[PDB]
Write a protein that binds this ligand. Structure first.
Ligand SMILES: [Cl-]
Lengths: 8, 305, 305, 8
């Protein structure tokens, strides 16, 4: 699937 | 001489990168004048990503819920709005390092430089192309969302891409700086797939002209072709159609080398039908399609900014 | 994910580039503090290049014979000396944009970013490796001499390369910032040739680890090899010997992927003896040797500066 | 031969 590339 | 995949100098963009944090979610933002632009998924948690109602999630956010850091300087957010898929955070200081700039929406086949960033600090710069299927083949990890793609013309930075997400097979998808996605994608953790990608024919032809200018001419044959006959073969190998506008755009390179575009096309047709037989062009064993004609002219004539 | 040839952000270096002109000869210089460093061939005319007596030519130059321009600002030269193959022009203003910096002499196999410049203004940035024969495969036109190669560590720029010249077959040769040439070359328009180049084996192994991290694992076999047996095959294909230090340098990548270095070596040996059979690794149809192990770690872990 | 890459 599509993965949103924000971070922790 | 020599020919390399060259990115734009990144200094003008580096002074614009900040970190935006909303709770545990952190990504990069672009600080221009008194506005910070960032992907709206910063207001998401990990559970919200499957099906986020972005309006509901943003109604619950106050200005102070956004922590914006430019290096050591914390910036006070004094307003916020959502435009399509990007947040706009009004901040109380204008960025002193703001360059002259434009927002542009690029066409597939066009190239730009990406400044890969994490936590508001740059990791690296590289050039990439907008693929015909509206993805780019970048190098992006978690945290990179908000990194931007750009072109430079003299002193004006044209921002054309904000990074948002990774799609299956490791390709990347994002928006223009007005927050509209390139291609038929949405900022949701759903099943989405990049469509079939094709080879940007006009860019391959530009790269073969680059090779000729650098003295790699073994693939030059003696035949010519018609545009329609060329496009019959190109189509079979998943190449985009060459249009008369493309032929005209290749005019300066054609004039420099003395090789008509339709003659270069005859040589490309033979490469496609017969392979390279172990040979390389410009150090490459595959045909390269991520140099536009302007990219070749810039590199081979030394245009500066 | 994804993997690309990534250059360092160039902002810190861009603020240091100036134009140096001595009569009709013009090239780039590096303005650090109150000194401008540039290749000494700026004091040459086109005839002087065949066999230049640099001491005689510089005795005839006064401070005012050097025109140094930083954009719009003309800089007054108040002293000049030659150190090996570089000029040092003392100027009357210290560069306010001087970063924290070191001069380093890099080893063959190491990589760095080049900021290609003409007339003191940047055209582009790209990453390159110091080849085993002490050349680099850059992209440099007339006017590019004085462009510099560099690495960044946090805030410190390590300058490692100043460009001077092009050798037959389109390879490039230069000096460290103390003015000593890399390799057995001289700044003269004489017959000089790059020696036989070899493939940096430790870098190929780093790149194969990069591929595994990105999920390209088709070339992984089930055998192992000894170091000595590996080096017998590598030598046949013009690869550098792998040393135990190299095996240790590959340790972090090995640990990350769970593949012992000697197992990766067994897979490289098969690629060398059998080819790729039309397949690609990381989008490439040839083995790539211009990523160091640190380059892979930086890109795959997202180190910032 | 070797070519010094200054400019005009
Ligand atoms: Cl290739």
């Amino acid at each position: 699937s599509a993965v949103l590339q924000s971070g922790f | 001489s020599g020919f390399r995949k060259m990115a734009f100098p990144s200094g003008k963009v580096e002074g614009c990168m900040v970190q935006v944090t909303c709770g545990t979610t952190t990504l990069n933002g672009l600080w221009l004048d008194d506005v910070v632009y960032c992907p709206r998924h910063v207001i998401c948690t990990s559970e919200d990503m499957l099906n986020p109602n972005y309006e509901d999630l943003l109604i619950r956010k106050s200005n102070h819920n956004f922590l914006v850091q430019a290096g050591n300087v914390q910036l006070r957010v004094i307003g916020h709005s959502m435009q399509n898929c990007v947040l706009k955070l009004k901040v109380d200081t204008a960025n002193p390092k703001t360059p002259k700039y434009k927002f542009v929406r690029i066409q597939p086949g066009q190239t730009f430089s990406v400044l890969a960033c994490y936590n508001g600090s740059p990791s690296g710069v590289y050039q990439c192309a907008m693929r015909p299927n509206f993805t780019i083949k970048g190098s992006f990890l978690n945290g990179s969302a908000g990194s931007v793609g750009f072109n430079i013309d003299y002193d004006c930075v044209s921002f054309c891409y904000m990074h948002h997400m990774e799609l299956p097979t490791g390709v990347h998808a994002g928006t223009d700086l007005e927050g509209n996605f390139y291609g038929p994608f949405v900022d949701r953790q759903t099943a989405q797939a990049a469509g079939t990608d094709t080879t940007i024919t006009v860019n391959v032809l530009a790269w073969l002209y680059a090779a000729v200018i650098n003295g790699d001419r073994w693939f030059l044959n003696r035949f010519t072709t018609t545009l329609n006959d060329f496009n019959l073969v190109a189509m079979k190998y998943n190449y985009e159609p060459l249009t008369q506008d493309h032929v005209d755009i290749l005019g300066p390179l054609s004039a420099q080398t003395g090789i008509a575009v339709l003659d270069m096309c005859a040589s490309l047709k033979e490469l496609l039908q017969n392979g390279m037989n172990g040979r390389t062009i410009l150090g490459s064993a595959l045909l390269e399609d991520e140099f536009t004609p302007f990219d070749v002219v810039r590199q081979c004539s030394g245009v500066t900014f």
